Amino acid sequence: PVIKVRENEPFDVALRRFKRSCEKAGVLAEVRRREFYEKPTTERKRAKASAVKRHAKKLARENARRTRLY
Amino acid sequence: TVSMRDMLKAGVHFGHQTRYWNPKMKPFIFGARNKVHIINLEKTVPMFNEALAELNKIASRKGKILFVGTKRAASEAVKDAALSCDQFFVNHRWLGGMLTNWKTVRQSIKRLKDLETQSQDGTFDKLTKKEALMRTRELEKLENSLGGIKDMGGLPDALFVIDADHEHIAIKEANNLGIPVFAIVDTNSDPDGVDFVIPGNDDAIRAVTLYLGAVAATVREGRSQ
Amino acid sequence: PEIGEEVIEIKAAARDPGSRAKIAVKTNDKRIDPVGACVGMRGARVQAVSTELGGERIDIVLWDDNPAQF
Amino acid sequence: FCRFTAEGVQEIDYKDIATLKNYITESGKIVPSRITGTRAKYQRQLARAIKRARYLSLLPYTDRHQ
Amino acid sequence: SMQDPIADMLTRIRNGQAANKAAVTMPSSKLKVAIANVLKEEGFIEDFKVEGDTKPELELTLKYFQGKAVVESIQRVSRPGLRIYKRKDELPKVMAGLGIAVVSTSKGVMTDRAARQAGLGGEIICYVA
Amino acid sequence: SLSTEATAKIVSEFGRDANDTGSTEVQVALLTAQINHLQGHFAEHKKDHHSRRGLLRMVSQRRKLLDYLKRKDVARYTQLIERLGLRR
Amino acid sequence: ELQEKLIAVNRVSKTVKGGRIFSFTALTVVGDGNGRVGFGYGKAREVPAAIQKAMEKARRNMINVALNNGTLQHPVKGVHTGSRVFMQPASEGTGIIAGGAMRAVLEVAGVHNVLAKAYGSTNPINVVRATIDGLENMNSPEMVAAKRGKSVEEIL
Amino acid sequence: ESFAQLFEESLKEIETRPGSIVRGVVVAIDKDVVLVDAGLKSESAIPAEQFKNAQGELEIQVGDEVDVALDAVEDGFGETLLSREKAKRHEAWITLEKAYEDAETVTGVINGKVKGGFTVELNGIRAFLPGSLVDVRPVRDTLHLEGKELEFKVIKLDQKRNNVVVSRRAVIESEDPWVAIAKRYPEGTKLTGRVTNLTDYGCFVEIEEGVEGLVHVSEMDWTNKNIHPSKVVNVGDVVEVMVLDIDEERRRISLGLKQ
RNA sequence: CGGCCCCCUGGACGAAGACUGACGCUCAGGUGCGAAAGCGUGGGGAGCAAACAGGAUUAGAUACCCUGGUAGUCCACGCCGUAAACGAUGUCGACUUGGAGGUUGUGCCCUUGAGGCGUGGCUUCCGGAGCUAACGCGUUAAGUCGACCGCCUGGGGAGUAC
């Protein structure tokens, strides 16, 4: 996330850019995840758990939308 | 009686998307154009006629017909049709166990009548404003629900339904009571509960109107007979 | 109740009060046994009408279909 | 809308530094195909080629590293 | 591996009835044909039609009465794991004779009742009801 | 695997038509040639168990073919092993 | 003309904040002494009410059975959820050889001669269910003859 | 009989996929939903915001006819894509007509340049334009009467993107997206782009040659976190967004809307 | 089993053809392979970390937390042969309604475009009949059958004792 302030560029705008860059770089998350060793099962476990939630989110909810609430 | 051209013009042949089809409708489907199912009219019309004949038979013996449609697209029309042949109908939400638990709904009808009498023949007015409002609101509520089956009589000898899957609750009740069923069955629906399936476009308004008008006519004919 | 429930389809009541009172009844295919309900446990309700207005030969017929079965 | 499909490339070339660049992040990372519309088959090749390039210093490992 | 074709044939019939299939096709064999003929004789199928020269396909036309299927139950009795042979006196009665038990005799394949009349036992292929 | 040219060379030798490519004799030869070829490979990489699995499969399949040959035609069976020099 | 037998009455509980709320289940069966049979299962706070419900339900959801003069028309197996039931026609006079709940239903059905053992579970509610199921599938010679398209004599 | 077939193809022959044949009769009007029947399976749930013209009020009562669009079927129940797009076809046709005589004659006011090119308006819709077109010469109609209406004379179009530059002035005068993605690039070239779908993190405005904008959620407004883009802008609407970033590599032009 | 490269190498799958011609299935014993830990010899040893030490906490804290930290984790060759070695689902074969995906082939179609129409393999999810104690499974079955094998027979005692 190297950044150079453009000419006549306000400081805050640059800073906001930098945060945007870090988010896109996804650095904080990566540091967080690497902070402690995750047993591979735990990793596999999370990944599969995560996927399942996505699918349930995508589908089961979509079907519900078909029916009105009130 | 109803010509096939007429149905096609209405838009009967059109069905639901393929991915929602119910395989029990495979016999009634003709094909799938543009990723949408097409109802084989050749198999439609004779079935429809057969049903119409059956209804006419029922009307002849002074049968009570019940028209069920709550799509809220075809709610107006079904009410209209039922009145045309002065039959009773349920254009709004089918009360669970309306037929099976008739003895209870019988009470609700009775309440409705009283409210109506109070409103009109009473001419009583001088009723507390908030009380009056509640009565009016209640009366409206019942009318919306049971208006069609207030002057229809009692349990129906036959049951015409505009969308099987949508009205499966009604379908089930009729099957438990054994009342013959005449359902418009779209491709997504399940025809098993139905006695006289009518493979057709439940959804489109014109088609629904087409469906009703024939039914209304044959009923009236049966009555005249 | 079933007829006080518009279930037991009761058309005409061709009966002669003071002697015999035979009447047929149908049902909108609800498998409720119109005559059975009209009779009851060993003519439970049948006895009621039997000694109701006076000793009458009340009878119930399981209406089949149309006038031919009538 | 995979470019490679229209080109129908039998195989992506790591030498094709411009084309890879067309899928390397300004920070130096690898693109999800969602964003490109690249088919997954070609995607795996693209990643492989990008790695190969990285090794020859044709592409950088990260914008920052030096 | 395919170890019992006859059992396979029956199963095809059983499922086909279950799924309300009009007709059921399978690789023909002389034995299968004989059985099919018996079923048609006893009226458990409308008709069977073998077709093909190199590797013929037997095609059965299932029977449905009043909606529900005609062949209520169909079991192998003899089977490669365990063969069953009955003498004319020991021939079974499926459903006390309402059903039929296909039995292979010296004098061709026949229903048990026929075999009893014929007066000779044999290998009991399958029960039908 | 066995190089295309090699296979053809074997096929021509053992197959009668040289197009047949299905003759029991031909298949055995093919397996044998490959088996011998790998012997060099596994001598080097003793721990490559996955590959060795494929080898055994080849061995097993070879054994069955021979056995099939044996009951069907002995003389061919005898002639064949003599050609390949299979102890059994 | 309908006879009614209450098979079993059982007390069942439902735990609530205060304590246990007890209720009763009545399993009853009714028949005409001919084909027509129907079981009823009622539930209520007081036994007499419960049994009355069961009688009430049983009277509906009847079912017909083809009965060779006194007995069944052929050996029949009937299963439901635990109870798997075998029952077999038997010579005149032998009476109803059957156990427990299965006994009662047969009686109202008007079967007078049956040999029937109830394998598997013997929980009243299911076993009666099986018997109904078995009797239900039981087909008469006339029925099959129609089914297969043959005369009865062809079937003998 | 074969009546059904011949008719079946006849009805195939008398209807087309796009919104081309003005066939749908308005059978029901209620704010804020119009609906028609163009001989499809089901009746369209039309917004009222495709069918009010240039001042906000509705224009078409029952019996009026506009085609809508198709090629997307049954998102579960119903049928269409909106007739507003159909009109885009008509605008393209009139624009093409210029070619015939090399002069489309329209009435165009290009007041000011969002992305270096004044925006020129057709009676209903508003477009974004290149810089050179806005005047044939350097007249620079910023000194002209605000929103002067003289004409529309095409200097530049991308011929794929909906970007048309009109010379409103001087009557007398008369793979593919990703190799050369540097036209809207420099820093802040504004664009007029229709939003497609708001994913609860963003809005996905994307109009220029099969590309994708994200504006997601951070700018969108002058409120950062409590915004929920669906509440704040629209669904299916042409907006002010600018590029603010191009990754021609990571093919994610991160547009903005706080500008 | 996961950076990239080369050498040797197994398997799977698709297209058509050509060939052999039942050569198949399963499998007691038997043979092999078999995570992690562990054992041996010899290397290697960053991080991490049983053991251990100390600091905390606590009534205690032989732990959770903190500061360190050796075996091991790594390499070679052997041994060990067990894991919730799990889909808690033996293997092979056939049949029985659908839907939505993923992935990998391949035929045709104006690819007139990312398309259109198929036809295979593997695979994820939902679900029909059916089945099931229910939970659920549901063409990858726990549905419908067939072949063979293994295994079960109350709980503890005990997968322990000899």
The answer to whether residue A34 sits within a structural domain is yes
The total number of structural domains in chain F stands at 1
User: For chain F, where are the E strands, in sequence order?
Assistant: none
- Tell me the angle at which helices F74-84 and F49-72 cross, rounded to the nearest 10 degrees: 140
Please provide the DSSP assignment of E3-71 as one string.
--HHHHHHHHHHHHHHTT-SEEEEE--HHHHHHHHHHHHHTSEEEEEEE-SSS-EEEEEE-BSSSSBS-
The 3-state DSSP class for residue G127 equals helix
Residues ≥6 apart with Cβ < 8 Å to A36: none
Q: In this structure, are strands E57-62 and E108-111 parallel, antiparallel, or unpaired? A: unpaired
d(CA B67, CA B64): 10
d(CA B205, CA G51): 51
Method of determination?
A: cryo-EM
Distance A26 CA to I56 C1' (A): 36
CA dist A14 → A21, D25, D63, E72, F58 (Å)? 10, 20, 18, 80, 67
The answer to whether residue A29 sits within a structural domain is yes
If you compute the radius of gyration of chain B from its CA atoms, what whole number of angstroms results?
A: 19
d(CA G137, CA E64): 16
Distance from CA of C44 to the nearest CA of G (A): 11
Q: Across the strands, what pairs with B65?
A: B158
The answer to whether residue A62 sits within a structural domain is no
Per the CB < 8 Å rule, is G89 touching E96? Answer: yes
Evaluate whether E35 touches E126 at the Cβ level (below 8 Å): yes
Nearest to H156, CA basis, from H194, H182, H188, H183: H183
The 3-state DSSP class for residue B15 equals strand
Is any atom of nucleic acid chain I found less than 7 Å from the CB of residue F57? Answer: yes
Q: In this structure, are strands G3-15 and G20-31 parallel, antiparallel, or unpaired? A: antiparallel
What is the residue extent of each domain of chain G? 3-63, 64-148
Encode F45-72: b = buried (16+ Cβ within 10 Å), e = exposed: eeeeeeeeeebeebeeebeebbeebeee
Please provide the DSSP assignment of chain D as one string.
--HHHHHT-SS--TT-HHHHHTTB-TTS-BPPHHHHT--HHHHHHHHHHHHHHHHTTSS-S-SS--
CA dist F47 → F41, F42, F43, F44, F52 (Å)? 11, 8, 10, 9, 9
Q: What is the DSSP letter of H195?
A: B
Q: Across the strands, what pairs with G14?
A: G21
d(CA B185, CA B44): 11
Contacts of range C44-49, beta carbons closer than 8 Å, 24 or more positions apart: C49/C21
Tokens, residue H184: 């809207």
Domain that residue F51 falls in: 1-88
- Length of chain F as a residue count: 88
Evaluate whether H168 touches H139 at the Cβ level (below 8 Å): no
Q: In this structure, are strands B181-185 and B158-161 parallel, antiparallel, or unpaired? A: parallel
Provide the residue type at B178 as one letter.
G
- Give the ranges where chain G is alpha helix by DSSP (H): 47-59, 101-109, 124-137, 141-148, 152-155
Evaluate whether A33 touches A42 at the Cβ level (below 8 Å): no
Q: What is the DSSP letter of B189?
A: S
Burial of C65 (0-12, 13-18, 19+ CB in 10 A): exposed
Encode F3-32: b = buried (16+ Cβ within 10 Å), e = exposed: eeeebeebbeebbeeeeebebbbbbbbbbb
Tokens, residue B216: 């209304």
Please give the protein residue whose CA is closest to the C1' of the nucleotide I134.
Answer: G81
CA dist A24 → D63, E107, H200 (Å)? 13, 85, 18
Cis link prior to H32 (omega < 30° from 0)?
A: yes
Strand-by-strand arrangement of the E57-62 sheet: E23-27, E57-62, E45-51
Evaluate whether H129 touches H164 at the Cβ level (below 8 Å): yes
Burial of B97 (0-12, 13-18, 19+ CB in 10 A): middle
- Length of chain D as a residue count: 66
Q: Across the strands, what pairs with E111?
A: E102
> Which of C8, C33, C45 should be substituted to probe chain G, the one whose Cβ sees the most G Cβ atoms within 10 Å?
C33
Tokens, residue G67: 């009965």
The angstrom resolution of this structure is 3.2
d(CA E56, CA D24): 60
Domain that residue A49 falls in: 1-56
What is the 3-state composition of chain G as percent helix, strand, coil, each rounded to the nearest 5?
A: 30, 35, 35
Q: In this structure, are strands C20-25 and H154-157 parallel, antiparallel, or unpaired? A: unpaired
The answer to whether residue A66 sits within a structural domain is no
The 3-state DSSP class for residue A15 equals helix
Burial of B33 (0-12, 13-18, 19+ CB in 10 A): middle
Give φ, ψ of A6 to 5 degrees: -65, 160
Is any atom of nucleic acid chain I found less than 7 Å from the CB of residue A55? Answer: yes
Give φ, ψ of E60 to 5 degrees: -95, 150
Evaluate whether B56 touches B65 at the Cβ level (below 8 Å): no
CA dist D4 → D49, H208, H251 (Å)? 14, 21, 15
d(CA B25, CA B32): 13
- Using a CB-CB cut-off of 8 Å, the residues of chain D touching A24 are 27
d(CA C30, CA B60): 20
- Length of chain C as a residue count: 70
Residues ≥6 apart with Cβ < 8 Å to F36: none
Nearest to B89, CA basis, from B29, B153, B6: B153
Evaluate whether E75 touches E91 at the Cβ level (below 8 Å): no
Nearest chain H residue to D20, by CA: H249
- In chain A the first and final C-alpha atoms are separated, in Å, by 49
The answer to whether residue A69 sits within a structural domain is no
Q: What is the DSSP letter of C3?
A: T
Assigned CATH for G64-148: 3.30.230.10
Is any atom of nucleic acid chain I found less than 7 Å from the CB of residue D1? Answer: yes
- Length of chain E as a residue count: 129
d(CA B91, CA B79): 6
Nucleotide closest to residue B26 (CA–C1'): I97
| CB-CB neighbours of C59 under 10 Å | 15
d(CA B185, CA H71): 26
Of C32, C41, C42, nearest to G60 by CB-CB distance is C32
d(CA E17, CA E11): 10
- Which class is G3-63 in CATH? alpha beta
d(CA B92, CA B75): 7
* Chain I footprint bases within 7 A of protein beta carbons: 3-5, 8-11, 17-25, 32-34, 48, 77-78, 92-100, 102-105, 113-114, 117, 124-126, 128-130, 132-134, 143-148
The answer to whether residue A47 sits within a structural domain is yes
The 3-state DSSP class for residue B51 equals helix
The 3-state DSSP class for residue H139 equals coil
Domains and CATH numbers, chain E: 5-69 (3.30.1370.30), 74-128 (3.30.1490.10)
CB within 7 A of strand I (chain E, 100-129): none
- In chain B the first and final C-alpha atoms are separated, in Å, by 17
d(CA F40, CA F48): 13
Q: Across the strands, what pairs with G8?
A: G27
d(CA D56, CA F68): 56
Within 13 A of B149's CA, how many CA atoms are on the CB side? 31
Please give the protein residue whose CA is closest to the C1' of the nucleotide I111.
Answer: D6
Evaluate whether B222 touches B58 at the Cβ level (below 8 Å): yes
Domain that residue B115 falls in: 102-146
| CA trace torsion G102, G107, G108, G109 (10° rounding) | 80
Tokens, residue D3: 């470019």
Q: Say yes or no: D7 contacts chain H, CB-CB below 8 A.
A: yes
